[PDB]
Design a protein around this ligand. Structure first.
Ligand SMILES: CN1CN([C@@H]2O[C@H](COP(=O)(O)OP(=O)(O)OP(=O)(O)O)[C@@H](O)[C@H]2O)c2nc(N)[nH]c(=O)c21
Ligand SMILES: CN1CN([C@@H]2O[C@H](COP(=O)(O)OP(=O)(O)OP(=O)(O)O)[C@@H](O)[C@H]2O)c2nc(N)[nH]c(=O)c21
Ligand SMILES: CN1CN([C@@H]2O[C@H](COP(=O)(O)OP(=O)(O)OP(=O)(O)O)[C@@H](O)[C@H]2O)c2nc(N)[nH]c(=O)c21
Ligand SMILES: CN1CN([C@@H]2O[C@H](COP(=O)(O)OP(=O)(O)OP(=O)(O)O)[C@@H](O)[C@H]2O)c2nc(N)[nH]c(=O)c21
Ligand SMILES: CN1CN([C@@H]2O[C@H](COP(=O)(O)OP(=O)(O)OP(=O)(O)O)[C@@H](O)[C@H]2O)c2nc(N)[nH]c(=O)c21
Lengths: 160, 164, 165, 162, 160
């Protein structure tokens, strides 16, 4: 149990080792981040959203989100994309990362605030996939619009 | 026929049948409820002390409800009970806050009665978010708005009040 | 061309339309992958069995309409089951409970479509109860039919009618 | 009865009621707006200087609108106000670019939306939805370019000939 | 933008208007096409050598088409052009394989040439509807057989 981007995570399944790694942003900035290695399954519980995150080494496997509005769902998705530590998320940063709280934030909270400010490049470069339509699951598009046919890769919105 | 009691009404099934399946659903406050979802078309009469009704229902869907009652408050009580009984998502999503009702003997009410008592205390969110529809003029019957005002032009989706 | 064939104990004869095929992976109600050849296009068929006959309109993974004429309600139900399976609809595939592992007399797996057919012939309750119900118009010579096979002049399983002729 | 002013029109509620729920929604440019979403069926008359209307509305949905006006501009102004007022998701997704309207006082989200669409209704009108209409005497349909039609109309929108 | 040639047909707009927005669409094969999407209700007459038509269209939607033609192939040619021109998602999803046509054609002419070569996937997947009996007009099936009971969604053939 822990906390990240306004969400309480609880690992329900799996495990990982934490490995320090330098990554490179889409503006060619160098970040030192603690990379988690292994398949994991989390419960995410926020104030206006909840999600099930299944996850591997630098890869989002599946996110199933419920929320009280459009914004809250968009928050969970962003948090989960940052949390996954995926390189296409890291490559989607535009400009330099200079966020402050006058103290300088850590690389993960740096990427989190950047995408919370503008999610558009993140969403529009993540990738679309054809969906199956299993029970109670709808797709969400890069413009936050729902779909029964296409979705952002590994991202589902629960209608349950 | 098979009879049961729910929400102060006797239901007797007059058409159709159903199977049950356990599903996890999420309230408007994002609380998990384990309910037995009934699957299939069914028709019921509902008989209470001050109102009666005919209900058609399908899998988590109120198809149609006609209520006959002594007064508007009894009619509302019947609509509430039918809407909860339908197991509809927009009913479940109309829940505000957590559900923690208990009985005299200190036993946690089951999920369906949890929803029932919640909406028996206050049905504003449920009624206002249920859906409104255009209706045809049919003699002997009227539409009803969320504030329980009769209407010959509009009605809460699938809900009618008998003038007989 | 596939305009004439046997399926589920019924002779199908195409009377309108045409189709193309595309091999597709569908997911059952127990998360089992089935490789089926999906027929794309509007088609109309007569179905002729020993105890029932029907007219079927179908499109891409959709039963458009079915009218069944039969000797008894059990035979009528058999025809409805076959037409629903044949339609390749997602709600039929999602109505599968458990894994499908049917075998013939010689010990081979049946193909996916016969896998689905034998499942629903064993028990069609989930299929019928989850298919969808609709309000019908009064049309003389025809009635609706409920999942429990009771005739109805008011409601019917979606797109399904029973002939009184 | 209940009244307020919005977009230069006096709204008077003639049927129905609503409750409010504060929500956050995303524009067609992913800008977050915090709005109070009104829930429930309501009918209003709208009275302006150059047009009047009857509006039916439900939760984030324009059910139907009939407008009577002195000319095409006045009729359009009423349609724009009714679409923004409805709080429809397709209206919010029609927003192009960021909203920063500003006495120098930054407008609330609803007036943010109103001012944007009073400037440029093209995206709003062209994306709203079109429908085939029945012939009803005393009434016509209206196309996005404000041309009257007896065959098609912007979804739920009619112009009175009275 | 109210008078032009497309697919061998002169289009003349008779009602409505549109705006354009450049967008990225995905083919049934996952090939990205950059197209200028026209937004708004418009009505056109289409005049070719061997067929004429009236077309109502909206944002990426064929509302209705009526075709008058000398024979089955000329009627089919007009239907194909109208369906491509409509910019519908189910036209784009009916594409099989990659598009690489050269005279390198723009996206819309890429789509057109592809469906002029093989309309089978497009016609079979377009959608079928029940129809009303209207004298002077018939339905048409994907195989181009006339029908007085069913038709490809929104498509009619004039008997005048
Ligand atoms: C990506 N993360 C992050 N994380 C946990 O998230 C919590 C808060 O993240 P943080 O504040 O950005 O970093 P920090 O406190 O320095 O810890 P860390 O360096 O391990 O990420 C930490 O307790 C960390 O262990 C994770 N925990 C598990 N189990 N799997 C993961 O993939 C991840
Ligand atoms: C939603 N329900 C509920 N219900 C019946 O309503 C009564 C009260 O519901 P309950 O408090 O959930 O009791 P329980 O026995 O746990 O419910 P169930 O039968 O669904 O398992 C019971 O007699 C139950 O059988 C129903 N009966 C029919 N025929 N169709 C239905 O959709 C439903
Ligand atoms: C779903 N089907 C099945 N089918 C035909 O039904 C017959 C028996 O079905 P099958 O043995 O389960 O399928 P099979 O022979 O493996 O292959 P296929 O479905 O690709 O034709 C075959 O001749 C097949 O062509 C069909 N024929 C037409 N015309 N339209 C259809 O939708 C379908
Ligand atoms: C969408 N609206 C807006 N609205 C009312 O229209 C007026 C102008 O809206 P506004 O500028 O957003 O003011 P505000 O007080 O923030 O709106 P609200 O009361 O929704 O929080 C206010 O009196 C507001 O109460 C409404 N009144 C009713 N009855 N039904 C509605 O759907 C709506
Ligand atoms: C889909 N189209 C296409 N089109 C016009 O059709 C003609 C041929 O289109 P084209 O060969 O794809 O070239 P192009 O200029 O790239 O088309 P566009 O306008 O989409 O950018 C052009 O003059 C174009 O403006 C249209 N004109 C109107 N009025 N409405 C429409 O929906 C469409």
């Amino acid at each position: 149990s822990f906390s990240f981007g306004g969400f309480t995570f609880k690992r329900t399944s799996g495990s990982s080792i934490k490995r320090e790694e330098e990554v490179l942003t889409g503006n060619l900035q160098t970040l030192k981040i603690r990379v988690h290695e292994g398949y994991e399954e989390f419960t995410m519980v926020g104030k206006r959203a909840t999600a099930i995150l299944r996850k591997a080494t630098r890869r989002l496997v599946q996110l199933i989100v419920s929320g009280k509005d459009e914004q809250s769902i968009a928050e969970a998705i962003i948090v989960a994309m940052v949390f996954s530590q995926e390189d296409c998320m890291i490559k989607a940063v535009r400009g330099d990362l200079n966020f402050v709280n006058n103290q300088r934030l850590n690389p993960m909270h740096q990427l989190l605030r950047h995408f919370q400010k503008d999610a558009k490049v993140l969403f529009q470069n993540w990738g679309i996939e054809h969906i199956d339509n299993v029970m109670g699951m709808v797709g969400v598009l890069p413009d936050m619009t729902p779909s029964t046919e296409m979705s952002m890769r590994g991202i589902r919105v629960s209608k349950m």
